[PDB]
C-alpha cells in the first residue's frame, strides 16, 4: 500500500485522467462533482528523498499538488482539433476523445457559454454551435500573459524579461503551434 502526500486547496470528487493540452498525452486531474470545479495534479520529484509518515516509510519523497486549472486551455485542445476538420459544430461533437473518455465532464461545466466567448466564434438561435477563432484566442492569451506578469512581480519569481518568461509558462498549457503565433503576436 503506497501512501501519497497531497497539498490541496483549503476548502477541500474523484481523480480523472484527461488529455494534456500542450503535450497531447495523459495527465491526472482532480474533478470536484458538487461544485463542478477542475484541478490539475502536479508532482514534486527530486532524487535522494523519502517520507516518514507517523510509523511508516514512503520510498518516494514525492509531494503532490492539486491546483485549479483554467478550463479554457483543455477546451481549446478540442476546439483547435475540430477547427481544421471543417466548420461550426455543437459542443458534443467537438469535445470527443476515444482515448480519454472523461472529457464529457467539460460539457457540464458551469458557465460554458461565457467562457467559450473568449476563444470562439458562435452561431445559434436560443443551440449551440461553436467554431475556433484565432483572433479571439491570441487576444485571450495576451490577457493570460498580463495576468501572470502581475502575479510574477507579487510572488517575486525572476518588463521584457518577465514577459518572455510568462510566455514560456503559458506555453505549457497551449500546443507548440499556438506558442509560435503568440510570440509573433
Amino acid at each position: 500500500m503506497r501512501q501519497h502526500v497531497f497539498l490541496v486547496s483549503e476548502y477541500l470528487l474523484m481523480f480523472v485522467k484527461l488529455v494534456n493540452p500542450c503535450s497531447g498525452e495523459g495527465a491526472i486531474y482532480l474533478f470536484n462533482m458538487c461544485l463542478q470545479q477542475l484541478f490539475e495534479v502536479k508532482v514534486f520529484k527530486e532524487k535522494h528523498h523519502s517520507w516518514f509518515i507517523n510509523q511508516s516509510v514512503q520510498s518516494g519523497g514525492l509531494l503532490h499538488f492539486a491546483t485549479p486549472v483554467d478550463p479554457l486551455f483543455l477546451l481549446l485542445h478540442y476546439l483547435i482539433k475540430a477547427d481544421k476538420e471543417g466548420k461550426f459544430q455543437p459542443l458534443d461533437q467537438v469535445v470527443v476523445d476515444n482515448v480519454f473518455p472523461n472529457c464529457i465532464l467539460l460539457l457540464k461545466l458551469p458557465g460554458l457559454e461565457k467562457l467559450l466567448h473568449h476563444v470562439t466564434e458562435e452561431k445559434g438561435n436560443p443551440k449551440k454551435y461553436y467554431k475556433y477563432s484565432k483572433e479571439k484566442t491570441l487576444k485571450w492569451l495576451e490577457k493570460k500573459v498580463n495576468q501572470t506578469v502581475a502575479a510574477l512581480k507579487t510572488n517575486n519569481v525572476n518588463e521584457e524579461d518577465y514577459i518572455r518568461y510568462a510566455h514560456g509558462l503559458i506555453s505549457d498549457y497551449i500546443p507548440k503551434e499556438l506558442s509560435d503565433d503568440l510570440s509573433k503576436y
Partner: protein
C-alpha cells in the same frame, strides 16, 4: 465503462483525520512499510545551534519544521496493490531534513511550495 479512468475518494474520510508527523529525509530508502519511528527517530531529535539535530544510519541530519502555506491543506492518501482511494491522515506542517545542514533557500522542495500561490493567479478568470 468510463469508470476505468476514474479513481474515487471517500469524502467522509477527509473529515476523520488526526494530524500525522511528516519528515522529509535527504536519503532514498528502498522499503515501503511500517517502521518504529517513535522508537529510533523521534526520541533522538535534539535542539542545536542551526536547528533540529538527529542522526540516521550514523549520518548527521539537520532540519527545520516547514509549515503548509495558508490556502493549502495536507492530506495523506492510501491506495491498494471500481477504483477507490481514501485520506487516512491530515497535516499542518512537515519537518525538512538535510545532510549536515538545513537545505538552502534554493532547495527545490521550497520552490515547489510557492507554486499553488502562482497557479491560483495563472488560472484565474480574465475580466
Amino acid at each position: 465503462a468510463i469508470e476505468r479512468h476514474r479513481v474515487h475518494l471517500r469524502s467522509a474520510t477527509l473529515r476523520d483525520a488526526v494530524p500525522a508527523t511528516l519528515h522529509l529525509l535527504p536519503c532514498e530508502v528502498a522499503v515501503d512499510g511500517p517502521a518504529p519511528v517513535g522508537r529510533f527517530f523521534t526520541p533522538a531529535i535534539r535542539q542545536g545551534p542551526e536547528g533540529l539535530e538527529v542522526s540516521f544510519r550514523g549520518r548527521c541530519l539537520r532540519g527545520e519544521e516547514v509549515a503548509v502555506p495558508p490556502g493549502l491543506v495536507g492530506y495523506v492518501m492510501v491506495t491498494e496493490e471500481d477504483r477507490f482511494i481514501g485520506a487516512t491522515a491530515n497535516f499542518s506542517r512537515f519537518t525538512l531534513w538535510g545532510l549536515e545542514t538545513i537545505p538552502g533557500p534554493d532547495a527545490k522542495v521550497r520552490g515547489a511550495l510557492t507554486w499553488p500561490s502562482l497557479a491560483a493567479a495563472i488560472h484565474a478568470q480574465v475580466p
